[PDB]
């Protein structure tokens, strides 16, 4: 395996790239190659801290570095025309940045926010200021430090600076918050426990049915007994929120009955009342091994979700569904617009966002495309709602704190957002403000599924870029 670390990655890059190739005139080619090495090391190290660093593990291999080196060679040669030295303002910075962002490295990148992160890294590194003696490769390093650019102009000086890099590396070198290391370490520890458990289970093979009976009974008391349906009437068929809540209630009730019947059949098999059919024995094996049954899994869930966590989430979701069902029975129109629903609990929260959009459109006689989303995180308990302002609870702001609806970068892993109050307003053509920042709202901690994009306001002089580098995002559920 390759020795992890920014210093090791940059040493490998400089060893791979020929010394003559770096030495070739103009002199700025050495610093350009150093910038390429630093950028490649930074992204390849951020790959480890996924999904915080990169939403998915892209293959930022040596082919990308070779393409980047060829691009830099060609463009620098064309600009210099054989001159021994060229001004740092003459280098085609725009061409280099665009090519690295859309062709060399952005070709593999498909996520819009990963592309945004790549653009921020490129705009921060590849600039005229990189040739200033006070350029900071990374800021707030190791709690309090800055990685200054090497002032040398030759490959020897750059490699020496690479070698004298401190051993003590932190994710703040890459741009991530320092707690990304803690998240990675606890993920690795949980993985090690799972691997050990797999080993012990194989040794345990060389009773189980009674323990499975206890587990099935416990899950049976965990899951609520039933979920009542909604009442489809002519008045409320027009209501988009109410249609969405019928769909949610029906799907949840169907899954509830399926899982309850499966648990009852497992209990009967354990007691000896029933034999093991093909599906029954497959389900029993999954329950014993702790693997989420595919038949049970019908709504998107975090990868690797265990059966116990899944039934706990199921119980909470059906409690929410029962609450909204009671609200609908009391009244299917006003309560469904003034209900504070948990976006994590809903099976398809993007459908809830679409339904709120449709409700506002019907209320204001507006087209769907003419609606823009605004978020007002209010702290007052049971805050009153506007004509078009909805209410969503349970949103988790990961990597920042929201005070007075303003974002400040925080070292905490996540902070809860009470009553985010998604509101829908008429879309305008005003330009995007500098202080506003677009935060993706991912479904879960995996960040593989995206629901919508909010536009929070950075506070004080927080750098919007710093936000993108830190990978701030909102999560529907923890």
């Amino acid at each position: 395996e390759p020795p992890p670390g920014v210093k090791a990655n940059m040493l490998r890059t400089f060893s791979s790239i020929p010394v003559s190739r770096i030495c070739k005139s103009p002199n700025e080619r050495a610093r350009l190659y150093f910038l390429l090495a630093w950028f490649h090391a930074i992204i390849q190290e951020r790959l480890r801290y996924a999904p915080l660093g990169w939403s998915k593990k892209y293959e930022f291999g040596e082919s990308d570095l070779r393409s980047a080196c060829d691009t830099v060679d060609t463009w620098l040669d064309d600009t210099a025309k054989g001159r021994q030295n060229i001004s740092p303002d003459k280098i085609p910075w725009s061409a280099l940045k665009t090519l690295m962002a859309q062709s060399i490295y952005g070709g593999r990148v498909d996520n819009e926010f990963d592309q945004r992160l790549l653009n921020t890294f490129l705009e921060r590194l590849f600039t005229t200021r990189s040739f200033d003696s006070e350029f900071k490769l990374a800021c707030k390093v190791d709690g309090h430090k800055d990685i200054q650019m090497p002032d040398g102009i030759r490959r020897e000086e750059f490699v020496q600076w690479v070698e004298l890099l401190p051993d003590t590396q932190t994710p703040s070198w890459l741009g991530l918050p320092n707690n990304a290391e803690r998240v990675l370490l606890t993920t690795q520890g949980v993985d090690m426990i799972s691997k050990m458990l797999k080993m012990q289970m194989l040794e345990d093979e060389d009773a189980w049915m009674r323990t499975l009976h206890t587990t099935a009974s416990n899950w049976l008391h965990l899951i609520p007994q039933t979920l009542s349906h909604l009442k489809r009437t002519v008045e409320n068929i027009k209501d988009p929120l109410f249609r969405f809540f019928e769909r949610e209630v029906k799907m949840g009730a169907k899954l509830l009955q399926d899982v309850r019947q499966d648990l009852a059949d497992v209990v009967q098999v354990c007691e000896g009342k029933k034999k093991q059919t093909n599906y029954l024995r497959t389900l029993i094996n999954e329950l014993v091994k702790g693997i989420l049954p595919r038949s049970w899994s019908h709504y998107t869930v975090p990868a690797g979700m265990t059966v116990i966590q899944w039934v706990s989430d199921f119980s909470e979701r059906i409690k929410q569904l029962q609450n909204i069902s009671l609200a609908a029975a009391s009244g299917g129109a006003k309560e469904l617009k003034n209900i504070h629903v948990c976006l994590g609990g809903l099976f398809v929260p993007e459908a809830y966002i679409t339904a709120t959009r449709q409700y506002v459109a019907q209320a204001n006689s507006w087209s769907l495309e003419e609606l823009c989303l605004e978020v007002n995180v209010t702290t007052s308990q049971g805050a009153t709602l506007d004509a078009c302002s909805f209410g969503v609870t349970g949103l988790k702001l990961q990597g920042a704190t929201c005070n007075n609806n303003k974002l400040s970068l925080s070292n905490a892993i996540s902070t809860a957002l009470p009553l985010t109050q998604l509101r829908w307003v008429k879309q305008t053509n005003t330009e995007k403000k500098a202080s506003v920042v677009t935060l993706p709202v991912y479904l879960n901690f995996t960040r593989a599924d995206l629901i919508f994009t909010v536009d929070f306001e950075i506070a004080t002089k927080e750098d919007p870029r710093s936000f993108y580098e830190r990978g701030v995002a909102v999560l529907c559920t923890e």
């Binding site: 070779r66 085609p92 725009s94 593999r108």
Partner: protein, 1177 residues
């Protein structure tokens, strides 16, 4: 090779002489061997081993010499490497007969399907494409002056390039003149578009836009004056509007394709100029402008072929001037622009491209589109189990020596050895290409060569290789350092919709496209999940095509009104005043509404109001078609409704079906069994015939009964003998039109089921290509008149491909009502005679129907009993149509019994009073035995007491005996069944014989029922626990029947229709009557009972279909089948079917489909019991 064509003798002298001598020797040896075919005798031939070795040596020399000759010819004309060995030999042999060359021009050139020569083929005047576009040369190529084919085909290619370059120069001059005249006049614009080919028109537009933007940026440099860029954008929008109007007005197909190409180009130009204005570009040197493809045309260049220079960022290409014909341009989204940037950077860096991503992202499409943008011959090599290595080296040499491109579609489809070898060859070629980029090599005189075919191939710098790969993967490691991978994702449906709406004539295409696509996503999300729903790109294409058709129809309608009046005509104004949103919403309704379940139509209207606020859709009923439908329904004994009446829903459904037929050639009729879809489309066909005057023909085909090979034909593995399948035979017949059948409406109704296997060859036919490709090579085009139609019950296993390609008409069960079925039964009873006031038995039928009318009503005894029966439990899944068919058959037997009574007492016929009593009693008897017939005695008693509670018929006065135990005699009075069971005395010789049947209440009852249903020739089916007297009761009934031959057929799990077909060919003869081929038993006068012992048992297909059950369904519904050895309808004359299946709850018993159970009455023969066993034994 030699004796096949007489020309190669002159082409290859000496070699022909050598082979002539060798053939003499070989034929002498083979004559010797024919004399003594023993292996030992053959071995003992004097010096036979030496003779064979000498023959092998000499033959090899000639074959090699021939290979050297063909290599020399291919090196003479480098494009020859794309045709095969025998194709090239044919080409060179038939040099004089140029009519034999036109089939290879498609292989040799990109878009030159054929060439145009002089009257006597002395000189070549130009070239032609597959689409008919013609490229007359500036200087004709003379075959007489250059007789050698490799000497005048080179001139043809060079003249093609030079003619295209000069035409491009003139076209660019004309476009510059257009630009100098500010506003573009549509007449002159259309004149120019007609004058120049599609490729050069698009090139001229791109060159003009590039020069305009360069001048605008140069003027605006060093200031904030955005007026030049704003003027460029305004001019582009004005040109787009002019093209929209022109494509809306009537055009020839070629000019329509040119307008669509120009619209696709101008939409991209508008988007790019908007991006530039938004980015506030100052000077032309900025990379936000340099990263866009720019076309520079220099009139000062001496070389015409090197006048056009396509640059984009670092890369700087030149147009290859290869005639590409009229090929559909790809909509250039920003994603495809980034893809172009990556591949152009790779090409400049001398690295072959390699896009990757999920299938359906247009990887090879984007590669081909870029290659055509640069004017290069792009050769797509498919890799899915059709690849080869023998010709691939030849094609590689051709690419290197002609400068063409090569795209490997799904390169991972190759096996390991094939992939390794092809990767080695590609690596050699790409290393040769990268040898061009070095500075040390003298680029002025650099003949870079590669090692191909164990030879030196001078690689032209223009060639490129694109290795498209599909993850699930990794690029080969040997060439991983030579290729730059690119990820491709789903394209912009918004931009595709903009381009298509603009090409349909919608001026406000931007807003409509930004509305319709989110509406389709809204439908796909909010609407319920059904198997027949398609809201994809093909559905959007169909909706927009329908919108264009509706807009053109409104244009023509207003034109006709204003022509009838004295007002002048201005189609421009007429188009301007039409509501585009209303047209689009009307088309969306006319397309989506037919396919929607009854619970989804209000949801669709709510979504449609959400996306298109303040827009309403009003369906315009077609009065002429409504009247024709009413006439056909009256003549077919079917109820017709005008909306909210009995039959209103069904009439609405058939009208929607007609609309779907008009919009799409290939369509489906999904819906639950017994919904009315076959009646709907047959009535529609008859009414369309009556109204339009064009006769309608229905080729009902069952696709599941006949295997895929027999359905689509199969070429023989030897001699390549092609056999025509059912579908291919029908298509060939309609194409030939021997009896003038191309002037008729032919509907290829694929009545059956859709599964992912039998529709694979049908996907291309249902596509816009409308072509049936065959492994033989014949390409069967779909005629415009023919419509492929499906009558599938459900699309549970249907593929998304067919679902998207076929227009859907959902036929819910509530469409056809029990009131409709009762009215149909009564109408057929009162009109259609049973024996054949036409006849006294017809008069009896009319009296019986008059008596039964109060019961066949909306809230009558039959309806209430049917609801209660549905509430009850049954052995098979109860269906309304099975119940009603059984009841109607029983009532037909009742009136037949009345006729028999009249015949028995001719002096005193059936009095009206006793007829009333008898029919009133037999109605209750038939209701009981049709609803509770397939149910246990408990549910039979429940239904009996329910009838007793809810009836007005006097019924038996029994204290406890169920009404099912009473038999209605000819006289209306009831009679118990227990009076018909005699205490017989069995002879000691037949104590337990396989024919003796002790008379029991169950036997006297089921035998009577079987007699009625077998006399009606219904496909009666018996159910019950194994051991119940199913076969015993059936054989006793057939013994009661005078002339009824029986053929027992025991079905197993694996009994394909082959067992039934062998039974047919054993017991029946394929007599050919004047009406048609008729299947009939060898014996005369006796009906054949194809008694199937275990009808549930046959195992379902991989997609839940029973093949033999579908076969029996076809032969009991349409009254025949198709002979696969002759492809002709084989009507069944005297074949009748009976089943004796076990209950579906028993293991291995697959439940029968409702489409089959609809025709077959089901009886539940249960175990005798204790008292019955005591009596019998």
């Amino acid at each position: 090779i030699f004796t096949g064509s007489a020309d190669i003798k002159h082409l290859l002298p000496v070699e022909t002489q050598r082979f002539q001598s060798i053939s003499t020797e070989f034929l002498a040896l083979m004559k010797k061997v024919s004399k003594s075919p023993l292996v030992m005798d053959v071995l003992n031939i004097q010096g036979v081993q030496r003779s064979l070795e000498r023959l092998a040596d000499l033959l090899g020399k000639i074959q090699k010499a021939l290979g050297e000759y063909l290599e020399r010819e291919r090196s003479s004309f480098p494009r020859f490497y794309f045709v095969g060995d025998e194709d090239l030999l044919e080409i060179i042999g038939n040099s004089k007969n140029v009519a034999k060359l036109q089939k290879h021009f498609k292989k040799m050139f990109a878009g030159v399907s054929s060439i145009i020569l002089n009257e006597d083929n002395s000189v070549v005047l130009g070239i032609s494409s597959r689409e008919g576009e013609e490229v007359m040369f500036k200087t004709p190529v003379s075959i007489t002056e250059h007789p050698k084919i490799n000497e005048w085909l080179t001139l043809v290619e060079k003249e093609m390039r030079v003619t295209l370059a000069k035409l491009l120069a003139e076209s660019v001059t004309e476009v510059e003149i257009f630009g100098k005249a500010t506003s573009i006049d549509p007449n002159t614009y259309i004149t120019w578009i007609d004058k120049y080919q599609a490729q050069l028109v698009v090139l001229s537009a791109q060159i003009a836009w590039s020069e305009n933007v360069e001048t605008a940026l140069s003027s605006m440099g060093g200031g904030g004056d955005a007026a030049p860029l704003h003027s460029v954008l305004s001019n582009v929008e004005v040109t787009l509007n002019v093209l929209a109007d022109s494509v809306l007005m009537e055009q020839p197909p070629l000019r329509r394709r040119k307008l669509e190409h120009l619209i696709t180009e101008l939409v991209h130009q508008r988007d790019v100029t908007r991006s530039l204005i938004k980015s506030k570009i100052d000077n032309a040197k900025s990379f936000e402008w340099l990263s866009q493809m720019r076309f520079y045309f220099d009139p000062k260049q001496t070389d015409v072929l090197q006048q056009l220079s396509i640059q984009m960022a670092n890369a700087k290409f030149n147009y290859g001037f290869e005639y590409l014909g009229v090929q559909d341009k790809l909509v250039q989204t920003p994603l495809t622009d980034r893809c172009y940037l990556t591949m152009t950077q790779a090409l400049e860096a001398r690295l072959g491209g390699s896009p990757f991503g999920p299938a359906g992202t247009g990887k090879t499409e984007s590669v081909k589109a870029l290659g055509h943008q640069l004017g290069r011959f792009v050769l797509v090599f498919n890799c899915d189990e059709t690849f080869d290595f023998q010709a691939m080296g030849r094609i590689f040499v051709g690419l290197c020596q002609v400068g063409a491109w090569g795209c490997f579609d799904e390169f991972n489809r190759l096996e390991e050895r094939m992939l390794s070898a092809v990767s080695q060859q590609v690596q050699c070629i790409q290393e040769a290409l990268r040898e061009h980029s070095n500075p040390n090599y003298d680029k002025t005189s650099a003949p870079i060569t590669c090692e191909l075919l164990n030879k030196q191939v001078k690689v032209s710098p223009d060639m490129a290789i694109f290795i498209t790969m599909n993850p699930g993967s990794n690029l080969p490691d040997n060439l991983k350092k030579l290729f730059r991978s690119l990820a491709m994702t789903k394209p912009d449906r918004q931009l595709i919709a903009q381009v298509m709406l603009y090409s349909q004539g919608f001026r406000t295409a931007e807003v409509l496209a930004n509305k319709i696509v989110p509406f389709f996503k809204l439908c796909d999300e909010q609407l319920s999940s059904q198997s027949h729903y398609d809201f994809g790109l093909r559905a959007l294409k169909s909706v927009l095509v329908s919108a264009g058709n509706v807009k053109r129809e409104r244009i023509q309608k207003i034109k006709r009104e204003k022509e009838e009046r004295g007002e002048a005509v201005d189609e421009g104004e007429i188009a301007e005043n039409l509501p585009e949103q209303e047209i689009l919403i009307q088309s969306v309704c006319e397309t989506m509404v037919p396919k929607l379940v009854a619970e989804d139509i209000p949801l669709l209207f709510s979504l449609l109001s959400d996306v298109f606020p303040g827009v309403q859709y009003h369906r315009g009923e077609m009065t002429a078609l409504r009247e024709e439908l009413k006439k056909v329904c009256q003549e077919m004994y079917l109820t017709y409704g005008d909306g909210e009446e009995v039959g209103g829903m069904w009439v609405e459904k058939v009208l929607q079906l007609y609309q779907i037929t008009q919009i799409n050639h290939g369509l489906m009729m999904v819906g639950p069994s017994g919904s009315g879809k076959s009646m709907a489309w047959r009535v529609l066909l008859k009414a369309l015939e009556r109204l339009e005057g064009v006769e309608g023909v229905a080729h009902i085909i069952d696709p599941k009964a006949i295997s895929k090979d027999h359905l689509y034909g199969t070429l023989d593995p030897n001699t390549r003998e092609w056999t025509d399948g059912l579908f291919t035979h029908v298509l060939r017949k309609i194409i030939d039109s021997v009896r003038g059948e191309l002037q008729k409406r032919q509907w290829i109704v694929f009545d059956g089921d859709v599964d992912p296997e039998w529709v694979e060859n049908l996907n291309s036919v249902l596509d816009d290509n409308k072509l049936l490709t065959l492994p033989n090579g014949e390409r069967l085009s779909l005629p415009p008149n023919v419509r492929i139609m499906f009558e599938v019950q459900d699309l549970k296993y249907a593929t998304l491909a067919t679902v998207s390609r076929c227009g859907m008409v959902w036929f819910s069960e509530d469409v056809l009502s029990t009131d409709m079925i009762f009215n149909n039964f009564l109408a057929r009873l009162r009109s259609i005679p049973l024996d054949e006031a036409a006849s006294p038995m017809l008069q009896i039928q009319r009296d019986a129907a008059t008596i039964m009318q109060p019961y066949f009503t909306s809230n009558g005894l039959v309806t209430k009993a049917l609801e209660h029966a549905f509430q009850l439990e049954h052995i098979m899944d109860l269906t309304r149509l099975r119940c009603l068919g059984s009841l109607f058959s029983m009532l037909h037997q009742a009136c037949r019994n009345v006729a028999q009574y009249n015949a028995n007492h001719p002096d005193f016929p059936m009095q009206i009073e006793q007829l009333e009593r008898y029919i009133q009693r037999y109605l209750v008897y038939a209701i009981l035995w049709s609803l509770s017939g397939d149910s246990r005695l408990k549910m039979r008693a429940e239904l009996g007491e329910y009838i007793r509670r809810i009836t007005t018929v006097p019924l038996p006065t029994a204290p406890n005996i169920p009404i099912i135990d009473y038999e209605v005699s000819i006289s209306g009075e009831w009679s118990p069944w227990q009076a018909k069971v005699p205490q017989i005395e069995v002879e000691t010789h037949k104590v337990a014989a396989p024919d003796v049947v002790v008379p029991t209440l169950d036997t006297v009852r089921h035998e009577a029922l079987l007699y009625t249903w077998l006399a009606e020739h219904k496909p009666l089916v018996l159910c019950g626990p194994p051991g119940s007297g199913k076969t015993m009761t059936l054989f006793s009934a057939l013994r009661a029947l005078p002339d009824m031959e029986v053929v027992g057929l025991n079905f197993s799990s694996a009994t394909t229709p082959e067992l039934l077909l062998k039974t047919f060919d054993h017991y029946c003869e394929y007599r050919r009557t004047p009406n048609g081929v008729v299947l009939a038993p060898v014996q005369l006068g006796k009906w054949l009972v194809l008694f199937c012992d275990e009808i549930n048992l046959p195992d379902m297909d991989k997609y839940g279909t029973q093949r033999v059950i579908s076969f029996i369904r076809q032969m009991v519904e349409h009254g025949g089948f198709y002979r696969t050895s002759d492809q002709t309808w084989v009507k069944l004359e005297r074949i009748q079917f009976v089943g004796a299946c076990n209950p579906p709850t028993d293991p291995g018993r697959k439940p029968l489909s409702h489409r089959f159970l609809r025709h077959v009455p089901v009886v539940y023969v249960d175990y005798p019991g204790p008292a019955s066993l005591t009596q019998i034994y």
